[PDB]
mmCIF file of all heavy atoms in Angstrom:
data_model
loop_
_atom_site.group_PDB
_atom_site.id
_atom_site.type_symbol
_atom_site.label_atom_id
_atom_site.label_comp_id
_atom_site.label_asym_id
_atom_site.label_seq_id
_atom_site.Cartn_x
_atom_site.Cartn_y
_atom_site.Cartn_z
ATOM 1 N N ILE A 1 -1.771 19.301 25.347
ATOM 2 C CA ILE A 1 -0.924 18.371 24.547
ATOM 3 C C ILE A 1 -0.211 19.054 23.367
ATOM 4 O O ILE A 1 -0.724 20.103 22.963
ATOM 5 C CB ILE A 1 -1.731 17.134 24.076
ATOM 6 C CG1 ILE A 1 -2.468 17.468 22.810
ATOM 7 C CG2 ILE A 1 -2.597 16.618 25.144
ATOM 8 C CD1 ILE A 1 -3.160 16.130 22.235
ATOM 9 N N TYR A 2 0.855 18.509 22.861
ATOM 10 C CA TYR A 2 1.542 18.931 21.693
ATOM 11 C C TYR A 2 1.013 18.220 20.441
ATOM 12 O O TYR A 2 0.812 17.046 20.467
ATOM 13 C CB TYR A 2 3.053 18.776 21.836
ATOM 14 C CG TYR A 2 3.761 19.711 22.764
ATOM 15 C CD1 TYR A 2 4.675 19.267 23.633
ATOM 16 C CD2 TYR A 2 3.339 21.024 22.668
ATOM 17 C CE1 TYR A 2 5.281 20.141 24.573
ATOM 18 C CE2 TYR A 2 3.905 21.926 23.560
ATOM 19 C CZ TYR A 2 4.883 21.458 24.473
ATOM 20 O OH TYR A 2 5.436 22.484 25.320
ATOM 21 N N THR A 3 0.863 18.997 19.342
ATOM 22 C CA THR A 3 0.592 18.247 18.122
ATOM 23 C C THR A 3 1.236 18.919 16.913
ATOM 24 O O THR A 3 2.040 19.898 17.047
ATOM 25 C CB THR A 3 -0.953 18.294 17.794
ATOM 26 O OG1 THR A 3 -1.562 19.562 18.002
ATOM 27 C CG2 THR A 3 -1.682 17.337 18.740
ATOM 28 N N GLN A 4 0.909 18.393 15.763
ATOM 29 C CA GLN A 4 1.265 19.160 14.475
ATOM 30 C C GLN A 4 0.723 20.564 14.431
ATOM 31 O O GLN A 4 -0.311 20.700 14.965
ATOM 32 C CB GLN A 4 0.712 18.249 13.268
ATOM 33 C CG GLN A 4 1.378 16.949 13.096
ATOM 34 C CD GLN A 4 2.767 17.254 12.475
ATOM 35 O OE1 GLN A 4 3.090 18.307 12.053
ATOM 36 N NE2 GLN A 4 3.664 16.138 12.463
ATOM 37 N N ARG A 5 1.549 21.386 13.767
ATOM 38 C CA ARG A 5 1.007 22.729 13.442
ATOM 39 C C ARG A 5 -0.379 22.646 12.825
ATOM 40 O O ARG A 5 -0.569 21.934 11.831
ATOM 41 C CB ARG A 5 1.927 23.626 12.727
ATOM 42 C CG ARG A 5 1.349 24.834 12.225
ATOM 43 C CD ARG A 5 2.323 25.972 12.286
ATOM 44 N NE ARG A 5 2.695 26.166 13.668
ATOM 45 C CZ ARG A 5 3.802 26.823 14.113
ATOM 46 N NH1 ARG A 5 4.688 27.307 13.100
ATOM 47 N NH2 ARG A 5 3.996 26.950 15.316
ATOM 48 N N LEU A 6 -1.337 23.343 13.319
ATOM 49 C CA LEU A 6 -2.664 23.430 12.717
ATOM 50 C C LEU A 6 -2.769 24.649 11.894
ATOM 51 O O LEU A 6 -2.726 25.821 12.408
ATOM 52 C CB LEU A 6 -3.762 23.432 13.819
ATOM 53 C CG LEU A 6 -3.661 22.334 14.784
ATOM 54 C CD1 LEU A 6 -4.699 22.440 15.826
ATOM 55 C CD2 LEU A 6 -3.629 20.961 14.156
ATOM 56 N N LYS A 7 -2.904 24.563 10.585
ATOM 57 C CA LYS A 7 -2.718 25.565 9.636
ATOM 58 C C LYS A 7 -3.759 26.710 9.761
ATOM 59 O O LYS A 7 -4.969 26.430 9.730
ATOM 60 C CB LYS A 7 -2.631 25.111 8.217
ATOM 61 C CG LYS A 7 -1.284 24.530 7.909
ATOM 62 C CD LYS A 7 -0.961 24.513 6.295
ATOM 63 C CE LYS A 7 -1.556 23.299 5.644
ATOM 64 N NZ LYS A 7 -0.896 23.005 4.440
ATOM 65 N N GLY A 8 -3.381 27.945 9.989
ATOM 66 C CA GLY A 8 -4.392 29.062 10.225
ATOM 67 C C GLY A 8 -5.096 28.939 11.513
ATOM 68 O O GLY A 8 -6.245 29.221 11.658
ATOM 69 N N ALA A 9 -4.302 28.507 12.496
ATOM 70 C CA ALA A 9 -4.737 28.500 13.924
ATOM 71 C C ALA A 9 -4.012 29.616 14.594
ATOM 72 O O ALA A 9 -2.778 29.665 14.422
ATOM 73 C CB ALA A 9 -4.670 27.238 14.649
ATOM 74 N N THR A 10 -4.676 30.413 15.449
ATOM 75 C CA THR A 10 -4.150 31.465 16.097
ATOM 76 C C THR A 10 -4.244 31.352 17.625
ATOM 77 O O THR A 10 -5.006 30.519 18.069
ATOM 78 C CB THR A 10 -4.891 32.827 15.686
ATOM 79 O OG1 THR A 10 -5.366 32.801 14.436
ATOM 80 C CG2 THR A 10 -3.979 34.066 15.918
ATOM 81 N N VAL A 11 -3.307 31.968 18.343
ATOM 82 C CA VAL A 11 -3.406 31.862 19.816
ATOM 83 C C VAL A 11 -4.643 32.379 20.307
ATOM 84 O O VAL A 11 -5.242 33.395 19.753
ATOM 85 C CB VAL A 11 -2.177 32.663 20.439
ATOM 86 C CG1 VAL A 11 -2.108 32.602 21.935
ATOM 87 C CG2 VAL A 11 -0.795 32.201 19.880
ATOM 88 N N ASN A 12 -5.179 31.770 21.371
ATOM 89 C CA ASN A 12 -6.514 31.885 21.914
ATOM 90 C C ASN A 12 -7.602 31.797 20.761
ATOM 91 O O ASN A 12 -8.244 32.753 20.342
ATOM 92 C CB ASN A 12 -6.695 33.300 22.451
ATOM 93 C CG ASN A 12 -5.641 33.486 23.573
ATOM 94 O OD1 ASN A 12 -4.926 34.538 23.611
ATOM 95 N ND2 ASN A 12 -5.635 32.637 24.445
ATOM 96 N N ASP A 13 -7.788 30.480 20.415
ATOM 97 C CA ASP A 13 -8.683 30.043 19.417
ATOM 98 C C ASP A 13 -9.426 28.998 19.875
ATOM 99 O O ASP A 13 -8.875 27.986 20.490
ATOM 100 C CB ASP A 13 -7.898 29.796 18.084
ATOM 101 C CG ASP A 13 -8.883 29.720 16.873
ATOM 102 O OD1 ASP A 13 -10.016 29.333 17.005
ATOM 103 O OD2 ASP A 13 -8.399 30.029 15.776
ATOM 104 N N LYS A 14 -10.719 28.835 19.690
ATOM 105 C CA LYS A 14 -11.479 27.744 20.035
ATOM 106 C C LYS A 14 -11.778 26.765 18.909
ATOM 107 O O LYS A 14 -12.403 27.126 17.938
ATOM 108 C CB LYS A 14 -12.955 28.234 20.715
ATOM 109 C CG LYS A 14 -12.653 29.141 21.877
ATOM 110 C CD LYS A 14 -14.034 29.529 22.517
ATOM 111 C CE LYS A 14 -13.858 30.568 23.544
ATOM 112 N NZ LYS A 14 -15.165 30.937 24.150
ATOM 113 N N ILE A 15 -11.230 25.526 19.040
ATOM 114 C CA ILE A 15 -11.361 24.541 18.010
ATOM 115 C C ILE A 15 -11.949 23.346 18.611
ATOM 116 O O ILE A 15 -11.960 22.872 19.672
ATOM 117 C CB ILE A 15 -9.953 24.270 17.352
ATOM 118 C CG1 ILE A 15 -9.064 23.883 18.490
ATOM 119 C CG2 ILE A 15 -9.517 25.506 16.721
ATOM 120 C CD1 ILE A 15 -7.671 23.325 17.899
ATOM 121 N N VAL A 16 -12.677 22.643 17.571
ATOM 122 C CA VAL A 16 -13.362 21.439 17.911
ATOM 123 C C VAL A 16 -12.801 20.281 17.061
ATOM 124 O O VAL A 16 -12.776 20.344 15.839
ATOM 125 C CB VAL A 16 -14.754 21.580 17.574
ATOM 126 C CG1 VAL A 16 -15.546 20.323 17.748
ATOM 127 C CG2 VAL A 16 -15.407 22.664 18.459
ATOM 128 N N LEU A 17 -12.338 19.310 17.865
ATOM 129 C CA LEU A 17 -11.681 18.043 17.254
ATOM 130 C C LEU A 17 -12.834 17.070 17.113
ATOM 131 O O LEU A 17 -13.409 16.637 18.029
ATOM 132 C CB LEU A 17 -10.536 17.572 18.069
ATOM 133 C CG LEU A 17 -9.511 18.478 18.346
ATOM 134 C CD1 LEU A 17 -8.696 18.089 19.594
ATOM 135 C CD2 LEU A 17 -8.615 18.805 17.191
ATOM 136 N N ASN A 18 -13.196 16.809 15.737
ATOM 137 C CA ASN A 18 -14.298 16.035 15.497
ATOM 138 C C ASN A 18 -14.115 14.521 15.086
ATOM 139 O O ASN A 18 -15.027 13.879 14.822
ATOM 140 C CB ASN A 18 -15.065 16.668 14.223
ATOM 141 C CG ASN A 18 -15.391 18.083 14.515
ATOM 142 O OD1 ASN A 18 -16.142 18.376 15.382
ATOM 143 N ND2 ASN A 18 -14.832 19.041 13.810
ATOM 144 N N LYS A 19 -12.850 14.084 15.183
ATOM 145 C CA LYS A 19 -12.647 12.792 14.944
ATOM 146 C C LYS A 19 -12.269 12.122 16.271
ATOM 147 O O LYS A 19 -11.346 12.185 16.950
ATOM 148 C CB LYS A 19 -11.338 12.572 14.008
ATOM 149 C CG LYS A 19 -11.569 11.465 12.951
ATOM 150 C CD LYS A 19 -10.634 11.997 11.725
ATOM 151 C CE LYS A 19 -10.359 10.860 10.739
ATOM 152 N NZ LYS A 19 -9.785 11.480 9.498
ATOM 153 N N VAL A 20 -13.392 11.377 16.741
ATOM 154 C CA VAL A 20 -13.312 10.735 18.124
ATOM 155 C C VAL A 20 -13.588 9.253 18.111
ATOM 156 O O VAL A 20 -14.707 8.862 17.997
ATOM 157 C CB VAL A 20 -14.195 11.530 19.089
ATOM 158 C CG1 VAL A 20 -13.956 10.911 20.478
ATOM 159 C CG2 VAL A 20 -13.869 13.027 19.068
ATOM 160 N N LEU A 21 -12.553 8.516 18.443
ATOM 161 C CA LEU A 21 -12.616 7.143 18.343
ATOM 162 C C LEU A 21 -13.255 6.419 19.467
ATOM 163 O O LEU A 21 -14.123 5.483 19.410
ATOM 164 C CB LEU A 21 -11.221 6.505 18.005
ATOM 165 C CG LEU A 21 -10.578 7.306 16.797
ATOM 166 C CD1 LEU A 21 -9.241 6.735 16.488
ATOM 167 C CD2 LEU A 21 -11.509 7.331 15.678
ATOM 168 N N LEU A 22 -12.913 6.937 20.750
ATOM 169 C CA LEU A 22 -13.277 6.304 21.872
ATOM 170 C C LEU A 22 -13.523 7.231 23.078
ATOM 171 O O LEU A 22 -12.742 8.023 23.352
ATOM 172 C CB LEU A 22 -12.274 5.289 22.306
ATOM 173 C CG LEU A 22 -12.608 4.306 23.313
ATOM 174 C CD1 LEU A 22 -12.786 2.853 22.798
ATOM 175 C CD2 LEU A 22 -11.538 4.371 24.435
ATOM 176 N N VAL A 23 -14.616 7.007 23.757
ATOM 177 C CA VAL A 23 -14.859 7.893 24.932
ATOM 178 C C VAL A 23 -15.120 6.985 26.198
ATOM 179 O O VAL A 23 -16.144 6.397 26.330
ATOM 180 C CB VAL A 23 -16.063 8.706 24.777
ATOM 181 C CG1 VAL A 23 -16.077 9.750 25.950
ATOM 182 C CG2 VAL A 23 -15.972 9.530 23.504
ATOM 183 N N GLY A 24 -14.056 6.988 27.125
ATOM 184 C CA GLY A 24 -14.265 6.352 28.414
ATOM 185 C C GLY A 24 -14.732 7.213 29.522
ATOM 186 O O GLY A 24 -14.418 8.382 29.622
ATOM 187 N N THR A 25 -15.603 6.616 30.363
ATOM 188 C CA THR A 25 -15.943 7.087 31.704
ATOM 189 C C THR A 25 -15.948 5.890 32.525
ATOM 190 O O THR A 25 -16.207 4.792 32.129
ATOM 191 C CB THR A 25 -17.518 7.630 31.647
ATOM 192 O OG1 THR A 25 -17.713 8.770 30.722
ATOM 193 C CG2 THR A 25 -17.952 8.030 33.048
ATOM 194 N N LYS A 26 -15.601 6.096 33.868
ATOM 195 C CA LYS A 26 -15.387 4.899 34.655
ATOM 196 C C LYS A 26 -16.738 4.157 34.858
ATOM 197 O O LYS A 26 -16.769 2.999 35.116
ATOM 198 C CB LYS A 26 -14.837 5.314 36.034
ATOM 199 C CG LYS A 26 -15.882 6.087 36.927
ATOM 200 C CD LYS A 26 -15.176 6.284 38.187
ATOM 201 C CE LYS A 26 -14.200 7.442 38.296
ATOM 202 N NZ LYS A 26 -14.130 7.977 39.657
ATOM 203 N N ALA A 27 -17.848 4.784 34.527
ATOM 204 C CA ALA A 27 -19.193 4.309 34.457
ATOM 205 C C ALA A 27 -19.482 3.571 33.157
ATOM 206 O O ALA A 27 -20.329 2.601 33.165
ATOM 207 C CB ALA A 27 -20.210 5.270 34.775
ATOM 208 N N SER A 28 -18.899 3.911 32.014
ATOM 209 C CA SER A 28 -19.197 3.272 30.679
ATOM 210 C C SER A 28 -18.128 3.622 29.650
ATOM 211 O O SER A 28 -17.143 4.331 29.880
ATOM 212 C CB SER A 28 -20.544 3.851 30.254
ATOM 213 O OG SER A 28 -20.481 5.371 30.005
ATOM 214 N N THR A 29 -18.186 2.838 28.462
ATOM 215 C CA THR A 29 -17.333 3.194 27.515
ATOM 216 C C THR A 29 -17.923 3.217 26.220
ATOM 217 O O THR A 29 -18.532 2.068 25.672
ATOM 218 C CB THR A 29 -15.877 2.463 27.507
ATOM 219 O OG1 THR A 29 -15.146 2.855 28.625
ATOM 220 C CG2 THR A 29 -15.177 2.654 26.228
ATOM 221 N N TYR A 30 -17.776 4.255 25.379
ATOM 222 C CA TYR A 30 -18.382 4.376 23.947
ATOM 223 C C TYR A 30 -17.329 4.071 22.999
ATOM 224 O O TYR A 30 -16.202 4.714 22.798
ATOM 225 C CB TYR A 30 -18.997 5.756 23.762
ATOM 226 C CG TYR A 30 -19.886 6.157 24.911
ATOM 227 C CD1 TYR A 30 -19.485 6.718 26.120
ATOM 228 C CD2 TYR A 30 -21.192 5.864 24.810
ATOM 229 C CE1 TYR A 30 -20.379 7.104 26.992
ATOM 230 C CE2 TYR A 30 -22.160 6.217 25.768
ATOM 231 C CZ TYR A 30 -21.661 6.865 26.985
ATOM 232 O OH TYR A 30 -22.566 7.175 27.838
ATOM 233 N N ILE A 31 -17.614 3.088 22.043
ATOM 234 C CA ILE A 31 -16.704 2.584 21.039
ATOM 235 C C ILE A 31 -17.226 2.806 19.761
ATOM 236 O O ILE A 31 -18.205 2.280 19.215
ATOM 237 C CB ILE A 31 -16.447 1.119 21.272
ATOM 238 C CG1 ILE A 31 -16.020 0.885 22.641
ATOM 239 C CG2 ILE A 31 -15.347 0.709 20.313
ATOM 240 C CD1 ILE A 31 -15.994 -0.620 23.203
ATOM 241 N N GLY A 32 -16.605 3.825 18.987
ATOM 242 C CA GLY A 32 -17.014 4.187 17.661
ATOM 243 C C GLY A 32 -16.835 3.160 16.552
ATOM 244 O O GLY A 32 -15.898 2.314 16.640
ATOM 245 N N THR A 33 -17.576 3.181 15.481
ATOM 246 C CA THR A 33 -17.425 2.340 14.367
ATOM 247 C C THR A 33 -17.585 3.224 13.036
ATOM 248 O O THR A 33 -18.646 3.371 12.499
ATOM 249 C CB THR A 33 -18.484 1.219 14.294
ATOM 250 O OG1 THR A 33 -19.770 1.821 13.964
ATOM 251 C CG2 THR A 33 -18.594 0.455 15.637
ATOM 252 N N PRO A 34 -16.442 3.865 12.683
ATOM 253 C CA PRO A 34 -15.102 4.015 13.316
ATOM 254 C C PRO A 34 -15.225 5.040 14.402
ATOM 255 O O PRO A 34 -14.432 4.975 15.333
ATOM 256 C CB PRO A 34 -14.249 4.636 12.165
ATOM 257 C CG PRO A 34 -15.036 4.761 10.997
ATOM 258 C CD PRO A 34 -16.510 4.649 11.472
ATOM 259 N N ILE A 35 -16.031 6.040 14.255
ATOM 260 C CA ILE A 35 -16.095 7.199 15.176
ATOM 261 C C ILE A 35 -17.333 7.299 16.042
ATOM 262 O O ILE A 35 -18.442 6.756 15.702
ATOM 263 C CB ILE A 35 -16.112 8.408 14.258
ATOM 264 C CG1 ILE A 35 -17.207 8.398 13.287
ATOM 265 C CG2 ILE A 35 -14.725 8.744 13.582
ATOM 266 C CD1 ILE A 35 -17.725 9.821 12.753
ATOM 267 N N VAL A 36 -17.133 7.834 17.114
ATOM 268 C CA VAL A 36 -18.388 8.176 17.994
ATOM 269 C C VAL A 36 -19.016 9.298 17.350
ATOM 270 O O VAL A 36 -18.526 10.341 17.083
ATOM 271 C CB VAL A 36 -17.939 8.548 19.385
ATOM 272 C CG1 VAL A 36 -19.138 8.596 20.324
ATOM 273 C CG2 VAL A 36 -16.894 7.596 19.922
ATOM 274 N N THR A 37 -20.349 9.087 16.972
ATOM 275 C CA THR A 37 -21.025 10.042 16.237
ATOM 276 C C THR A 37 -21.535 11.227 17.047
ATOM 277 O O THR A 37 -21.817 11.027 18.305
ATOM 278 C CB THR A 37 -22.247 9.441 15.579
ATOM 279 O OG1 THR A 37 -23.169 8.896 16.565
ATOM 280 C CG2 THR A 37 -21.804 8.315 14.699
ATOM 281 N N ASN A 38 -21.412 12.348 16.560
ATOM 282 C CA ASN A 38 -21.810 13.594 17.281
ATOM 283 C C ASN A 38 -20.882 14.034 18.335
ATOM 284 O O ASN A 38 -21.105 15.127 18.955
ATOM 285 C CB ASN A 38 -23.248 13.611 17.801
ATOM 286 C CG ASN A 38 -24.390 13.445 16.723
ATOM 287 O OD1 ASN A 38 -24.408 14.250 15.765
ATOM 288 N ND2 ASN A 38 -25.231 12.396 16.750
ATOM 289 N N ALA A 39 -19.828 13.246 18.669
ATOM 290 C CA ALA A 39 -19.010 13.568 19.735
ATOM 291 C C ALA A 39 -17.950 14.539 19.306
ATOM 292 O O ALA A 39 -17.360 14.502 18.107
ATOM 293 C CB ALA A 39 -18.282 12.271 20.157
ATOM 294 N N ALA A 40 -17.672 15.578 20.175
ATOM 295 C CA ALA A 40 -16.774 16.558 19.844
ATOM 296 C C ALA A 40 -15.893 16.985 20.987
ATOM 297 O O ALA A 40 -16.368 17.005 22.181
ATOM 298 C CB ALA A 40 -17.492 17.769 19.312
ATOM 299 N N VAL A 41 -14.697 17.326 20.729
ATOM 300 C CA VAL A 41 -13.770 17.808 21.779
ATOM 301 C C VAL A 41 -13.369 19.258 21.646
ATOM 302 O O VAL A 41 -12.744 19.613 20.664
ATOM 303 C CB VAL A 41 -12.325 17.009 21.653
ATOM 304 C CG1 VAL A 41 -11.628 17.205 22.897
ATOM 305 C CG2 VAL A 41 -12.747 15.562 21.531
ATOM 306 N N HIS A 42 -13.938 20.098 22.594
ATOM 307 C CA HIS A 42 -13.623 21.446 22.521
ATOM 308 C C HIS A 42 -12.260 21.696 23.270
ATOM 309 O O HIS A 42 -12.108 21.338 24.396
ATOM 310 C CB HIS A 42 -14.842 22.267 23.265
ATOM 311 C CG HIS A 42 -16.039 22.073 22.660
ATOM 312 N ND1 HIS A 42 -16.806 20.831 22.761
ATOM 313 C CD2 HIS A 42 -16.870 22.861 21.806
ATOM 314 C CE1 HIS A 42 -17.941 20.976 22.144
ATOM 315 N NE2 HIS A 42 -18.049 22.186 21.610
ATOM 316 N N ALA A 43 -11.400 22.202 22.487
ATOM 317 C CA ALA A 43 -9.969 22.600 22.998
ATOM 318 C C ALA A 43 -9.604 23.939 22.525
ATOM 319 O O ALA A 43 -10.287 24.517 21.508
ATOM 320 C CB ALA A 43 -8.986 21.665 22.456
#
């Protein structure tokens, strides 16, 4: 996906997006208050 420039991010960099509001699985859905705790997105 496209986003805002991430300051001091370099090409081929492993980053973790730690603000995660909602996680769906066709089997279940996790709804944060506000955030899903301990949930992280590796991108």
Side-chain angles (χ1 to χ4, degrees):
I1 78 178
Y2 286 135
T3 53
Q4 287 288 348
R5 165 139 302 160
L6 310 177
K7 287 203 272 199
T10 327
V11 178
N12 302 128
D13 195 328
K14 299 184 188 181
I15 56 171
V16 175
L17 305 161
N18 301 300
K19 226 147 161 169
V20 184
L21 311 183
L22 192 108
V23 190
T25 297
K26 67 176 86 161
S28 63
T29 289
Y30 306 88
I31 308 165
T33 72
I35 52 154
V36 192
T37 62
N38 294 310
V41 190
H42 302 72

